[PDB]
Design an enzyme around this catalytic site. Sequence first.
Site, PDB file in Angstrom:
ATOM      1  N   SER A 231       0.777  -1.248  -0.043  1.00 31.61           N
ATOM      2  CA  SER A 231       0.109   0.145  -0.070  1.00 31.61           C
ATOM      3  C   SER A 231       0.746   1.143  -0.196  1.00 31.61           C
ATOM      4  CB  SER A 231      -1.105   0.115   1.205  1.00 31.61           C
ATOM      5  OG  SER A 231      -0.209  -0.088   2.520  1.00 31.61           O
ATOM      6  N   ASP A 232       0.438   2.400  -0.616  1.00 31.73           N
ATOM      7  CA  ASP A 232       0.869   3.478  -0.195  1.00 31.73           C
ATOM      8  C   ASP A 232       0.479   3.766   1.212  1.00 31.73           C
ATOM      9  OD1 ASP A 232       1.904   6.138  -0.492  1.00 31.73           O
ATOM     10  OD2 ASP A 232       1.002   6.813  -2.202  1.00 31.73           O
ATOM     11  N   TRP A 233       0.949   4.711   1.777  1.00 34.15           N
ATOM     12  CA  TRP A 233       1.139   4.868   3.290  1.00 34.15           C
ATOM     13  C   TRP A 233      -0.244   5.289   3.906  1.00 34.15           C
ATOM     14  CZ3 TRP A 233       4.763   2.194   1.691  1.00 34.15           C
ATOM     15  CH2 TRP A 233       5.893   1.941   2.495  1.00 34.15           C
ATOM     16  N   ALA A 235      -3.108   3.936   2.918  1.00 37.57           N
ATOM     17  CA  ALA A 235      -3.905   4.008   1.727  1.00 37.57           C
ATOM     18  C   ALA A 235      -4.925   2.558   1.764  1.00 37.57           C
ATOM     19  CB  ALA A 235      -3.147   3.894   0.370  1.00 37.57           C
TER      20      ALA A 235
END
Length: 713
Positions: A231-233, A235
């Site tokens: 994941s993006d942080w 996300a």
Amino acid sequence: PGDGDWAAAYKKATAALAKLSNTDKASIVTGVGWEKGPCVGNTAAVASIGLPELCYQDGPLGIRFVQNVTAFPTGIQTASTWDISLIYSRGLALGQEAKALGINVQLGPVAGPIGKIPEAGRNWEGFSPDPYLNGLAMSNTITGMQDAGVQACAKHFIGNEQETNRDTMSSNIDDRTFHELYLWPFADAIKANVASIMCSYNKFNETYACENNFLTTILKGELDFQGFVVSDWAAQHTTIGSANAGLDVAMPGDNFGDNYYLWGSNLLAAISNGTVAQSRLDDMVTRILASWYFVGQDQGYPAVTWSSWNGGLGGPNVQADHKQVARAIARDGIVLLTNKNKALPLKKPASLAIIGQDAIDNPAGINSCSDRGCDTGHLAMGWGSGTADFPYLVAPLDAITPLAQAQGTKLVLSTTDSTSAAASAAAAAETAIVFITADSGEGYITVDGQLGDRNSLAPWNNGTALVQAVASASKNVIVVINSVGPLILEDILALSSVKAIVWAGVSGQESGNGLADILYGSVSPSGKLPYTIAKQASDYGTAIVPGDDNFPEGLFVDYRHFDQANIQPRFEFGYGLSYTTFQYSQLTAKYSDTSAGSSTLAPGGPKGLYDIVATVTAKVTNSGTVSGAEVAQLYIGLPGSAPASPPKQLRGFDKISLKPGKSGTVTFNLRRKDLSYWDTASAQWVTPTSGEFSLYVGASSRDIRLQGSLKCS
Ligand SMILES: *[C@@H]1O[C@H](CO)[C@@H](O)[C@H](O)[C@H]1NC(C)=O
Ligand SMILES: *[C@@H]1O[C@H](CO)[C@@H](O)[C@H](O)[C@H]1NC(C)=O
Ligand SMILES: *[C@@H]1O[C@H](CO)[C@@H](O)[C@H](O)[C@H]1NC(C)=O
Ligand SMILES: *[C@H]1O[C@H](CO)[C@@H](O)[C@H](O)[C@@H]1O
């Protein structure tokens, strides 16, 4: 599982998986929490299989936070070289540093955004709004990085084309546009055996990317991706949604430090209660471990001895000789835009005024703004997570001063953006070089009232007005521009005293050395624009949207739009001047494989997509009086049998260095995919089979020198 080159990795992964408890498995897929580990993200060690505390570290152009690392040129500067050898070498050099620091996963390079919206704030991290160029940059960067032994991470999948409302808006992209444009560099990345892909903050087709089953159906299905999705942080939004959609790793694990974990024991609960299959967690771990084994990190990898959060201290100095490739890209990605009767290179001027704060390092310190969140002094990086601390920054004046002194030229300094001091210094010298910028970054930082995305395509810091002041008091003005992306230059160009415009880009620690290498003529500039510079902002046909983006422009982004709509740009995609001239002749085109292509699925899609089916060549001659390199370009027009498409699409480039009067051959090898289109009817790539492809070879998307065709059989 194990398709392509991944079978030995998967064998090792499957064997390790069999030794793990469910709590071991959960700890492999669930980040430890924001700032809890020493890296930007970590998962816990699993001693029973010798797995370390996996270290995920930003960013695409250098190691974020850690001291004594290299601050390489930006992605877009790297693309601007059009030089696959330099692109590969920057990736190798980055990956060397990452490994030496014990970084397991280096968080780049950037395939999304491609930069369809010229204002969008992170486009400089990427590899252009041309999918072919972008894809070659992606594959050469990844191969470099992973040859050094780090896992690369292609990000951000997908449709995060603006920073404005990035964590709530939806990008809704039609099937064809999705496959031909935005997916295309991710497919190249997967074919190059990228270890990981990061999913984005935005919704896609109204569902958050990290919760969207397209992770499974497109990345892992269509493209047969064998690695893992991270994941993006923060996300990740739900426990069950993300798992079932095909997410493999949740970073940083909690919601930026809130100590609440949607996975961890919560994921084990979802399995216990029947909402997530055990097989799904097993699949996540198998993938993460496969990527680990695939790049060979299971034997003899360095340990992390530093922290992101203590000033970046505790590690070894890993810079090695990496400044060399940093300088070569700072130099060779410069694009010369105008040069009237050989204003450049400079040649023993009696006096030179040096104007603009962009000429000197930030007086408060080159690393004094957090995450490079200002445009003060010399600009060599945009802001946000795609940053690094400069070990030093060669500003233009640092490099020019000794070179001017050796020639006895006198320097008149006006290194602020004051227009009165600027006109004043311009009047006192034979020639004036004025330094202007435009900046942007990730959408968690506001600079000059702009939260990531740029609010215009005008120079920052009153740059246009600075140039106008200098032009008012000098007959001989050279404009140096350090910008993250396209700018409208019509006001600058209307000034008759502006004799040369150098589009120097945003080029990392060696910036000012690369610039002087061109300004004083040691090397001819050889960069070409990786985007279009329009005469007005409305000509791009795209802009930052206030809500959802339905991508109505479809396939027609950057030069594809200018071409389809018949809009003359000011400087086209692929344009760049040299201190010499080149002539093109002798076009050849040959189908070397007219057969049917293999449909066996491998990472990147049906294997036949990537077979070389044809080759085009040409002869290029340096027709001028100094040495130079030319970037020859191939654009393809599809036959009338194909659906309506951009008139020209880049499908080859080759950079050739030639001494005065010398000639060489350029070669463009075409993959089957390069000659295909996505047919929504049959939901697959089609290669046309009647009519003929149009072949356009030249110096830019509009300076077409040769034309030919390839019979479609
Ligand atoms: C997104 O929506 C478009 C238009 O509805 C649809 O056809 C396209 O296939 C979707 N793509 C997905 C879910 O990957
Ligand atoms: C299953 O467990 C998950 C994770 O704690 C939870 O969100 C969900 O409500 C549970 N569902 C049921 C039907 O128990
Ligand atoms: C960087 O490396 C040099 C050379 O070893 C070392 O002396 C210096 O202290 C290091 N700086 C930091 C901040 O670690
Ligand atoms: C300063 O430098 C410019 C660019 O080389 C010259 O063209 C001008 O005459 C002056 O010497």
